[PDB]
Amino acid sequence: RGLGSEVIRIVVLGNVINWSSTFLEKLQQEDQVFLIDTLIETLRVLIDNERLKQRVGDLIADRIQACDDAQDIYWGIFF
Incomplete structure (x- = not known):
């Protein structure tokens, strides 16, 4: 990190x-x-994760870059 x-x-x-x-x-x-x-x-201020952070990435970065029902929880937590 x-x-x-x-x-x-x-x-x-x-x-x-x-x-x-x-x-x-x-x-x-x-x-x-x-x-x-x-x-x-x-x-974010400096892509799939780019749209996931800037935008919500509803089923765009999530359906592509998220899985295991865990990254979806964080996506619901914030954009």
Whole structure:
């Protein structure tokens, strides 16, 4: 998180989808997706996540970039 702006979004989106398919937690998943919401928020002013943060991304960035019913919770949390 405290590294930069771009090496996250190039490679890590598919892998968070992967181990969201695997992981099973209740509460630290919430902390994860919410700090990632703030993450993509600080990536907003400087794309799929670009529209997801700027716009709501209703079934555009969510149907494409979100899955596992976890990123949808954060999408409902905020844009």
